[PDB]
Amino acid sequence: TDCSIVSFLARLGCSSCLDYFTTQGLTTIYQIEHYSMDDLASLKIPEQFRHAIWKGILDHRQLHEFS
């Protein structure tokens, strides 16, 4: 299912990154479900968080496919 980016990041310990999404009008996981690492870099997400967030996004993709 879709979910808020607030909820999604909280599960990954990446809540400090919320504003990078919200300032761009990004509020749901479906909006960012196909974001790559390059895309997260474009949002200016600090490097310490990027791989963790991206791996979370990939997991959501996979759960979505096999749901």
UniProtKB/Swiss-Prot annotation:
* Source species, domain of life: Eukaryota
- SAM domain: from which residue to which, for each copy? 1-63
Q: Which residues form the signal peptide?
A: none
Q: Where in the cell is it found?
A: Nucleus
Tissue specificity of this protein: Widely expressed, notably in heart, kidney, placenta, prostate, skeletal muscle, testis and thymus, although the precise isoform varies according to tissue type. Progenitor cell layers of skin, breast, eye and prostate express high levels of DeltaN-type isoforms. Isoform 10 is predominantly expressed in skin squamous cell carcinomas, but not in normal skin tissues.
Q: How is it modified after translation?
A: May be sumoylated. Ubiquitinated. Polyubiquitination involves WWP1 and leads to proteasomal degradation of this protein.
Binding partners and assembly: Binds DNA as a homotetramer. Isoform composition of the tetramer may determine transactivation activity. Isoforms Alpha and Gamma interact with HIPK2. Interacts with SSRP1, leading to stimulate coactivator activity. Isoform 1 and isoform 2 interact with WWP1. Interacts with PDS5A. Isoform 5 (via activation domain) interacts with NOC2L.
* Known role: Acts as a sequence specific DNA binding transcriptional activator or repressor. The isoforms contain a varying set of transactivation and auto-regulating transactivation inhibiting domains thus showing an isoform specific activity. Isoform 2 activates RIPK4 transcription. May be required in conjunction with TP73/p73 for initiation of p53/TP53 dependent apoptosis in response to genotoxic insults and the presence of activated oncogenes. Involved in Notch signaling by probably inducing JAG1 and JAG2. Plays a role in the regulation of epithelial morphogenesis.
Entry's free-text remark on domains? The transactivation inhibitory domain (TID) can interact with, and inhibit the activity of the N-terminal transcriptional activation domain of TA*-type isoforms.
Per the record, the similarity remark reads: Belongs to the p53 family.
Which disease relates to this protein according to its record? Acro-dermato-ungual-lacrimal-tooth syndrome: A form of ectodermal dysplasia. Ectodermal dysplasia defines a heterogeneous group of disorders due to abnormal development of two or more ectodermal structures. ADULT syndrome involves ectrodactyly, syndactyly, finger- and toenail dysplasia, hypoplastic breasts and nipples, intensive freckling, lacrimal duct atresia, frontal alopecia, primary hypodontia and loss of permanent teeth. ADULT syndrome differs significantly from EEC3 syndrome by the absence of facial clefting. Inheritance is autosomal dominant.
In Swiss-Prot or TrEMBL terms, this protein is called Tumor protein 63
| Protein's organism | Homo sapiens
Q: Quick one: which gene encodes this?
A: TP63
- The part of the entire sequence present here spans 545 to 611 of 680
